[PDB]
Amino acid sequence: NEKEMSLLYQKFLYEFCRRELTSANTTRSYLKWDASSISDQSLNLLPRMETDITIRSSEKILIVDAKYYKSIFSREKFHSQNLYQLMNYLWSLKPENGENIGGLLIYPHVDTAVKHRYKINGFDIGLCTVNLGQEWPCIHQELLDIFDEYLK
Amino acid sequence: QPVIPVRNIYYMLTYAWGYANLEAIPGNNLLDILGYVLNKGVLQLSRRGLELDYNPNTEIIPGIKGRIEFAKTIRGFHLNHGKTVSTFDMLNEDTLANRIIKSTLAILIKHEKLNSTIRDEARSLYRKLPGISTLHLTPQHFSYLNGGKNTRYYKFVISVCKFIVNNSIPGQNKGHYRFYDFERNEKEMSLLYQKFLYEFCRRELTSANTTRSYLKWDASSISDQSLNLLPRMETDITIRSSEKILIVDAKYYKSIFSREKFHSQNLYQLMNYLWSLKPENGENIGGLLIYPHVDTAVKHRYKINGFDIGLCTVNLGQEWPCIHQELLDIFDEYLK
Amino acid sequence: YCLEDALNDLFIPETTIETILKRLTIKKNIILQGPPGVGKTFVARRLAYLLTGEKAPQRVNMVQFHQSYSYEDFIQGYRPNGVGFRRKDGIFYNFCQQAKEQPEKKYIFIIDEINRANLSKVFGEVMMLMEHDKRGENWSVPLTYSENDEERFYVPENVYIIGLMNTADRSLAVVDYALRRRFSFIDIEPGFDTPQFRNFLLNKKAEPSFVESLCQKMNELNQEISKEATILGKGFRIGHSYFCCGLEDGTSPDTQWLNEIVMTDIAPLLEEYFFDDPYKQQKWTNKLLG
Amino acid sequence: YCLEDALNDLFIPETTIETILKRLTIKKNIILQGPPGVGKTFVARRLAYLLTGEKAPQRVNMVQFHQSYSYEDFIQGYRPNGVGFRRKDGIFYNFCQQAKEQPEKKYIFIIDEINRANLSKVFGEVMMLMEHDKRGENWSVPLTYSENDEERFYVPENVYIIGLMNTADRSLAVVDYALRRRFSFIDIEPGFDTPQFRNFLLNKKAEPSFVESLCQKMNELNQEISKEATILGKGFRIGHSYFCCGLEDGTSPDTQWLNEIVMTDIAPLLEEYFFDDPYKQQKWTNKLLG
Amino acid sequence: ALNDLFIPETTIETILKRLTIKKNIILQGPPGVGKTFVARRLAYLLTGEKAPQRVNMVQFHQSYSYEDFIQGYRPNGVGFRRKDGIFYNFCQQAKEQPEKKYIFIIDEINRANLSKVFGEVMMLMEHDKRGENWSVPLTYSENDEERFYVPENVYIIGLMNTADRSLAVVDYALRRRFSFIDIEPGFDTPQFRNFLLNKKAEPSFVESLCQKMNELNQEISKEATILGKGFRIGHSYFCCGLEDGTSPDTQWLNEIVMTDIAPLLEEYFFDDPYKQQKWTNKLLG
Numbered sequence A: 001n002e003k004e005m006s007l008l009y010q011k012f013l014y015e016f017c018r019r020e021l022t023s024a025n026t027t028r029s030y031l032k033w034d035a036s037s038i039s040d041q042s043l044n045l046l047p048r049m050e051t052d053i054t055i056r057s058s059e060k061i062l063i064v065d066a067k068y069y070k071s072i073f074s075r076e077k078f079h080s081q082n083l084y085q086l087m088n089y090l091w092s093l094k095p096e097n098g099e100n101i102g103g104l105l106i107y108p109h110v111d112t113a114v115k116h117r118y119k120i121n122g123f124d125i126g127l128c129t130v131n132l133g134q135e136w137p138c139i140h141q142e143l144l145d146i147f148d149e150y151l152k
Numbered sequence B: 001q002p003v004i005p006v007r008n009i010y011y012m013l014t015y016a017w018g019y020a021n022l023e024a025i026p027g028n029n030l031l032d033i034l035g036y037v038l039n040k041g042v043l044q045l046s047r048r049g050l051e052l053d054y055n056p057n058t059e060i061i062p063g064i065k066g067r068i069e070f071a072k073t074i075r076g077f078h079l080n081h082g083k084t085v086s087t088f089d090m091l092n093e094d095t096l097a098n099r100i101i102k103s104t105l106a107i108l109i110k111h112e113k114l115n116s117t118i119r120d121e122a123r124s125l126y127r128k129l130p131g132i133s134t135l136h137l138t139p140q141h142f143s144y145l146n147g148g149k150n151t152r153y154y155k156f157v158i159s160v161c162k163f164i165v166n167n168s169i170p171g172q173n174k175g176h177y178r179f180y181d182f183e184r185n186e187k188e189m190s191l192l193y194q195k196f197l198y199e200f201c202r203r204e205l206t207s208a209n210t211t212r213s214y215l216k217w218d219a220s221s222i223s224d225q226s227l228n229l230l231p232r233m234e235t236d237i238t239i240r241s242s243e244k245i246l247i248v249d250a251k252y253y254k255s256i257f258s259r260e261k262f263h264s265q266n267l268y269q270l271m272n273y274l275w276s277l278k279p280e281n282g283e284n285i286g287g288l289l290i291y292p293h294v295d296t297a298v299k300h301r302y303k304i305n306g307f308d309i310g311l312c313t314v315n316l317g318q319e320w321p322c323i324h325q326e327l328l329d330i331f332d333e334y335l336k
Numbered sequence C, D: 001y002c003l004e005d006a007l008n009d010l011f012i013p014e015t016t017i018e019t020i021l022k023r024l025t026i027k028k029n030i031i032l033q034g035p036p037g038v039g040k041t042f043v044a045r046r047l048a049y050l051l052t053g054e055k056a057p058q059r060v061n062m063v064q065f066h067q068s069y070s071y072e073d074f075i076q077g078y079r080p081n082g083v084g085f086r087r088k089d090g091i092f093y094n095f096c097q098q099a100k101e102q103p104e105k106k107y108i109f110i111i112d113e114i115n116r117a118n119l120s121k122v123f124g125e126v127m128m129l130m131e132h133d134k135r136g137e138n139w140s141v142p143l144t145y146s147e148n149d150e151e152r153f154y155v156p157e158n159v160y161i162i163g164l165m166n167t168a169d170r171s172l173a174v175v176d177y178a179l180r181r182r183f184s185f186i187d188i189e190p191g192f193d194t195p196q197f198r199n200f201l202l203n204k205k206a207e208p209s210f211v212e213s214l215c216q217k218m219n220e221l222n223q224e225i226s227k228e229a230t231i232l233g234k235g236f237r238i239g240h241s242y243f244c245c246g247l248e249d250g251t252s253p254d255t256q257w258l259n260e261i262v263m264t265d266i267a268p269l270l271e272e273y274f275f276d277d278p279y280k281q282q283k284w285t286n287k288l289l290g
Numbered sequence E: 001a002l003n004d005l006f007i008p009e010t011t012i013e014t015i016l017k018r019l020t021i022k023k024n025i026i027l028q029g030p031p032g033v034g035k036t037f038v039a040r041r042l043a044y045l046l047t048g049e050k051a052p053q054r055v056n057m058v059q060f061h062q063s064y065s066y067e068d069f070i071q072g073y074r075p076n077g078v079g080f081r082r083k084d085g086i087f088y089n090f091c092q093q094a095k096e097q098p099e100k101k102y103i104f105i106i107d108e109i110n111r112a113n114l115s116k117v118f119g120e121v122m123m124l125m126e127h128d129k130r131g132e133n134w135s136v137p138l139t140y141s142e143n144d145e146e147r148f149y150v151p152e153n154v155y156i157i158g159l160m161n162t163a164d165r166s167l168a169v170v171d172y173a174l175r176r177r178f179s180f181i182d183i184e185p186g187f188d189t190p191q192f193r194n195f196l197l198n199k200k201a202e203p204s205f206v207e208s209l210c211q212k213m214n215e216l217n218q219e220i221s222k223e224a225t226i227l228g229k230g231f232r233i234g235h236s237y238f239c240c241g242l243e244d245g246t247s248p249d250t251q252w253l254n255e256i257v258m259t260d261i262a263p264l265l266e267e268y269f270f271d272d273p274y275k276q277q278k279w280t281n282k283l284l285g
Ligand SMILES: Nc1nc2c(ncn2[C@@H]2O[C@H](COP(=O)(O)OP(=O)(O)NP(=O)(O)O)[C@@H](O)[C@H]2O)c(=O)[nH]1
Pocket: C009, C010, C011, C012, C034, C035, C036, C037, C038, C039, C040, C041, C042, C043, C164, C166, C240, C241, C242, C244, C245
């Protein structure tokens, strides 16, 4: 099912980054809210916010969240609900260096591969789709191209 | 497997539809409650009178009635056997609105799990409407009636009839029907809840102004002005008053009913509405998260990213009037 | 005849009337949709004098649709003669033949309450031919009851059609979207806010304070009407025709006069409009009276 | 009649016109099914002249169906004289008789607004012959009003029938059974995202960026309507003919011209479509103005 | 008139047994199974002679009326004159030769209203109430003594189209009297193949041809409540079009698929084009 596939896709991307991108350092890091309340100090009620995948480079830190969504597989309106999560991760995270912030969204697609770049709130966020079912070796070659570009 | 007591649900539907004694009925399940409304609702109408819409009829009769259509008369040579094709305005209760009530009453009758007394009265009413024609109901029929020529009262029962039709499933027998377990599914319960508040707020919060507000991203894209790929963002509700603006996002989750880990995914949506929304008046910007809980209600406040945000719950299942106080009490606190 | 002469007393803005002529001359068929009492009938007879530019009645024809009009009546139908039937050319067919008598001078056909009748039945062949592009001899078409010898009927270019659809009765609404493309819809507002309405009241021995009060109270009511959409939509909002009339004798406007208006006409109108709680009726009647 | 005149101005793809021409020669009974404002009537006059290869009125006949249309007028029937009843050959009967004389030359009959009338009441017996396989003298039939069985009527193979149907109304969900079997539907896309539609605007002093912005909005708008099935189907979606018109004077395209068009055409159309959600109207209208 | 009929031999014999008893058969089935053709050929078998004159065929439509069918008053030059119908005339011919069998084919019988059309005579045309004993005065008969009786020889054959979505409920009047008989598409049968085999079609093309359509027909029947079995595509298109002597091959097949089956799928499948694309691909690929 999609929940298994979406959860699968996240893990497949995570290790994929570990193997292929030997140069970069990739981690899944726990994040903390800016919030302070008199009522609860621990902020237990508030959701646990954990990055799907963080890859860090000297120029910037890249955060990516990717999932399997049924609508994108077919050929209209775009099911990009997870973008809401992404900003909250970036906004909540203030890096000590403060140089730059990196955002990308990657989605599984079958028919075609699309890439876009966005500047939304002064933050670097990019949305792309990759064709799947073409062939494993060249698709791997294709995925490598995406990480190179947006990492810059 | 805890859910809202069924009687309380009916009140949220009433506000959801934008428009009674339930103490009498002993059938707790929803269809028992809902049928008693419709079954009594039709009876309230008949006292004042059902809608009678003049339906023009062009038919072949032995004489002049209203306006004779000369062309159809000569072309078919109806004059020779003492007949004319004439147009006249029969007054019936067979209107589309009225037919829908009767067809639903059959559905109510056919339901296997229903109070016996309720079915007895309904079967009487189906008999009491001889002229009206039974129909095979689809949403497409109700779609035609969105014009709302009917009165404010009729639109209520039709909404009830719309609900039953959509929530009807075959049961033990091919003919009979079985009611959907509406409460269990979050999506329809949430869509009720989100609409319940939006319609609730306009009625009670006469003080404030209530609008659902479409929001546009602050983004610009070098590729496209359109920004179709970006998510469409429309507030659940915004309740603006001169002193403070406020956006509320409310959703029904089963996980939250458990008193452990907490489901607050909706909050991710909320902040971005606050950020992308920019106030011309510049009084203040606030947010509220409201969810339904069963046992008790707890309110917390937060100062997250320069925004004043509320996490709060309401104990549905307590009592409906006290709930009305509790809902207004909450909005008073945060709105101010 | 000219715009200044017509617009002396009209409470409609100049903006729409030019907008009307912008759409009408390019498109040649329009509809003025507004609530009852906003001068839809009033302007339409006046517009005829503008476009022709002269006050001649022959170039104008006015009719109303009564939900009993049929193709037999409008264009071509069979009518009894003494013992046997004959074919009678309808009113529009008679009009178009006049219209092509001289193409230079424009001809107007004004159809009040167009919304009522089943328009697909009445116009029939004309529904295609009415449109601006589909005019002239190129698009000649043979009619239903036409003679065996080929005779074809085309809407001449000069003809302009104006329709007057009130938006109060919802049922009687054009939902034939194929037909709604031929016509251009120009909303007409109640006309309270404008000074040109106010100047009409002031000149008839009226205090400016009461005048400004009147519009303030009415506009509050119409928003309450406009806000709802389930039953009372934007279109139902109250027109200004009630206040216009009855002051010709010299009756000065005052709350005594307004009291007659509200109790007699508006107060029945409101109770039918809402018909859920009397309290809402008592509120708005008292607000106007207060 | 060279294709070069015909096909540049048209917005419909040269791919689809080919498919249209295939089925029409093969089946001879064709229906163009599309929303109002997509040039259904526009092409059909051109397609007839394409097939014949020449501009001749005689070989092409055009009619619009409506509820009053009946067999007695279309094919054969009796018309009153001052007293007497005389049989009269109808259009299709008279038209096919022309077609019999010249079998080689293709003949076209264009039937607009076909859905409005029940085909059975009009064609009647002739729906049997009218089908593509059942043509020619072998299948000849004597008509209902024929004085003797000897006189016979057969739809000659040369004539091709073109029918223009608009899916703009809720009633057409129950499509007539008669149409589907004997006619072959062809769907007409609205066609904003077309090269030729843009080129029409570009030649008329239009900014390239402004045009593409418009296409993104309308394609988005029509997509919203396509999602619904209960209230608004795919066929309800907006056509491309509001924007074509009104530029003949030389007035350049701009947001001002678009603003009049939205206010006077597409804004009230959306009011009719989206009655239940007034804000949903506002969401698009400002978006279209944007 | 029985050398090559694609319908199985068992059913066509069953109809003959059923018809000689009931005398009123309705043939259901999808369009493109030659409902008119089998009925026309069956008529000759029932007589045993391939003669056109005894047989008459009419297509019903909603505005078909008793006035056309039986008796009506059409005008002559001056005054109204009663005009014999089709069936009335047909029976006057049948009375001449009671020993012989006369047969009436009524196409698209479901479409018209039977009662307004047949009128009084609907009671008689049932097999029991036939002959001189049940003669009744007709509606337009000026003299009471003249009566109309349906002779025993007359057999009524009706063709009804299952495919239409528009259909919801069959007329009661039809079902009481007529015995509905279902005609399968018969896409996979010996005679249809052997017909194709004699024509220049290799055996592989046959199995390819039968196999690919069979899955499509199977698919629609599988979704039984969503769509009836009778929607399933027939075989008449593949029969037609080969009069020119063209060899039937995949090159030829693609024309019928795109021209005839493709719109049929478009009308049948109005929900998902992706589903349509799946089934078009298999036929050729
Ligand atoms: N003198 C004057 N009267 C006006 C003006 N505007 C509206 N009226 C008056 O208000 C009355 C009704 O106007 P009318 O056009 O009939 O409104 P309507 O929409 O056509 N009416 P209905 O919808 O009922 O058909 C008339 O007395 C009309 O002259 C105006 O600007 N000046």
